[PDB]
Design a protein around this ligand. Structure first.
Ligand SMILES: *[C@@H]1O[C@H](CO)[C@@H](O[C@@H]2O[C@H](CO)[C@@H](O)[C@H](O)[C@H]2NC(C)=O)[C@H](O)[C@H]1NC(C)=O
Ligand SMILES: *[C@@H]1O[C@H](CO)[C@@H](O)[C@H](O)[C@H]1NC(C)=O
Ligand SMILES: *[C@@H]1O[C@H](CO)[C@@H](O)[C@H](O)[C@H]1NC(C)=O
Ligand SMILES: [Cl-]
Ligand code: NA
Length: 575
């Protein structure tokens, strides 16, 4: 079929993505040798379909070929994976991925003129190396996403190579491609992390909630059928099985498209498009309009006297149906808010169905939902007002202080990333009509990044408790945490807190990132201080920086005018 053709056609690209994600230390020369092995396997299976290995799991084939490369498992420290076979080997390979890609060099940027020359002379080589470099730095991003990203990156290179000011074009036009990649990455890590911590049974409520919001005219049975396809799709994609991921993604899009009528109205130009665009499209299409005849409630869950019986006959399906009906009627709610509501409903019924008069007790379920949602909504409203008052940077500094207090054991680079990701929820969403849904959806992804994808991280006991107990209530849990008062920092050199003359300028993100790192390191150093004292000290340093840039020889200015943060005898290090 078309999917098998797409895979056969793109086998070189597919192989690079898989190899680079699994073995992020592997060199580009090493990639080329695996490419030749998989092309050959592809040709062999075409010559002889009934041969044994031609019906094996795709990952089992790829991992066999990687493990067969002389000295490679030992060179990149994955010999322990190759000493296992089949499922145990697949699991080991999955555990081998590293979220922290700081062991890699800075992304190798080509000279714009040579990049353009390379694009015209050797296009396959350029895209091959791009895809290698992207995949090893984004080990959990799903293949259809990465291939779409490569396509868009190619359109950027093609268009910008025709312009006079090539550098400005490349830098500008790359921004939304990067944002796409980072948005999908965050979302995929969130779902995969949840799958590993809690299993498919808790997690497929996520897909019921999202699909029911997006396709509110769908029938329950068809939704459940689609949810089964989606859950399988996440199983393979979360594993890292690139071939199975592509196949299962194509199945989901075909399932959706082959019932366009009786699912959706707003996906026609998507059901035209190519693999894998037709599906990155469907994912980006907006929510279909609710059936005009859909009221705000379903009295079948609060007004019927059959609730406890329906629940008892099949609790999983009963709660799936609740999630379907409630989600499709509340397009304004976030996914985490819907899952909190499902849990509250489940807890409510545990109590009510064992009381003297259950119908009199569960009749008031919507009052419980109303209170919990009002609390969430008020919190978002407060955070959005704070954003309006302080701007992006000002709010970010408050988050950096709070996050560093609560999770000081994280690297500064990580804390800085988490702070930027947190503030982006507010810059993207505040003031929109679905502000609540947008903010809570995007904010929740931060704690998904924090809690880990293929590891149960051990940060500190309070953070670990929030990561591992209760997906839907994870953000509220994090909001309740106090500073970790057991923390004692390592020494920090005085140079971490020294402003250098080269930093005086107008810049986008590297100068932003330097300021952000300063604040985080300061908070680690002075963790004992109150948030207000830290904010005050930081604004002192900020004021001094601003003046000294407007001074000529800015660095002598900084050292005479900056506040001191050392204990009396400290010159080289601060403790
Ligand atoms: C991370 O934590 C999760 C949840 O505790 C672990 O997943 C469980 O692992 C046990 C034993 O391997 C299985 O019997 C359970 O079925 C798993 N539960 C779920 C919900 O998936 C996971 O193994 C941990 N990661 C490790 C130990 O590396
Ligand atoms: C990787 O394996 C080598 C060879 O046994 C070992 O010396 C080294 O310590 C290992 N490195 C890591 C990071 O595990
Ligand atoms: C809660 O109920 C009140 C009164 O009916 C209503 O005004 C409000 O919109 C509801 N809030 C939520 C979050 O549903
Ligand atoms: Cl990733
Ligand atoms: Na590095």
């Amino acid at each position: 079929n078309s999917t098998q053709k797409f895979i056969e056609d793109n086998i070189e690209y597919i192989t690079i993505i898989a190899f680079a994600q699994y073995v992020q230390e592997a060199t580009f020369e090493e990639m080329e040798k695996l490419v030749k092995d998989m092309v050959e396997y592809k040709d062999r299976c075409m010559a002889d379909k009934t041969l044994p290995e031609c019906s094996k799991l795709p990952n089992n084939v790829l991992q066999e070929k990687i493990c067969a490369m002389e000295g490679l498992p030992q060179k990149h420290n994955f010999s322990h994976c190759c000493s296992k076979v089949d499922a145990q080997r697949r699991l080991c390979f999955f555990y081998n991925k590293k979220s922290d890609v700081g062991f890699l060099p800075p992304f190798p940027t080509l000279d714009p003129e040579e990049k353009c020359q390379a694009y015209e002379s050797n296009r396959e080589s350029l895209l091959n190396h791009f895809l290698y470099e992207v995949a090893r730095r984004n080990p959990f991003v799903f293949a259809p996403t990465l291939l779409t990203v490569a396509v868009h990156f190619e359109e950027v290179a093609k268009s910008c190579c025709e312009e006079q000011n090539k550098v400005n074009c490349l830098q500008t036009r790359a921004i939304p491609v990067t944002q796409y990649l980072k948005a999908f990455s965050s979302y995929q890590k969130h779902v995969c992390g949840a799958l590993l911590k809690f299993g498919t049974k808790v997690v497929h409520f996520i897909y019921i909630a999202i699909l029911s919001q997006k396709f509110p005219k769908i029938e329950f049975k068809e939704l459940i059928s689609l949810v089964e396809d989606v859950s399988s799709n996440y199983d393979g994609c979360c594993e890292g099985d690139v071939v199975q991921c592509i196949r299962d993604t194509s199945k989901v899009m075909n399932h959706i498209c082959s019932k366009q009528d009786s699912i959706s109205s707003k996906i026609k130009e998507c059901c035209e498009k190519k693999i894998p665009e037709r599906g990155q499209c469907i994912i980006n299409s907006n929510k279909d309009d609710r059936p005009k005849d859909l009221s705000l409630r379903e009295g079948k869950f609060t007004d019927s006297e059959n609730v406890c019986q329906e629940r008892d006959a099949d609790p999983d399906t009963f709660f799936a149906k609740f999630t379907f009906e409630y989600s499709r009627r509340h397009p304004d709610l976030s996914i985490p808010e819907l899952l909190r509501i499902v849990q509250i409903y489940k807890d409510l019924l545990r109590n009510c169905c064992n009381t003297e008069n259950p119908p009199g007790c569960y009749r008031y379920a919507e009052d419980k939902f109303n209170e919990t949602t009002e609390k969430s909504l008020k919190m978002v409203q407060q955070e959005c007002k704070h954003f309006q008052n302080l701007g992006k940077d000002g709010l970010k500094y408050h988050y950096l202080i709070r996050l560093t207090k609560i999770a000081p054991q994280l690297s500064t680079e990580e804390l800085v990333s988490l702070g930027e990701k947190m503030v982006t929820a507010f810059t993207t969403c505040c003031t929109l009509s679905e502000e609540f849904a947008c903010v809570d959806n995007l904010a929740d992804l931060v704690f998904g990044e924090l809690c880990g994808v293929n590891e149960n991280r051990t940060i500190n006991p309070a953070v670990d408790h929030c990561c591992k107990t209760n997906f839907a209530f994870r953000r509220p849990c994090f909001e309740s945490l106090k500073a970790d008062k057991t923390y004692v920092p390592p020494p920090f050199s005085q140079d971490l807190f020294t402003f250098h003359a080269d930093m005086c300028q107008s810049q986008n993100e590297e100068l932003q990132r330097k300021t952000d790192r300063f604040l985080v390191n300061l908070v680690k150093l002075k963790h004992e201080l109150t948030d207000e004292e830290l904010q005050s000290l930081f604004t002192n340093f900020a004021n001094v920086v601003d003046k000294c840039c407007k001074a000529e020889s800015p660095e002598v200015c900084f050292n005479e005018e900056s506040p001191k943060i050392g204990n009396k005898g400290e010159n080289l290090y601060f403790q």
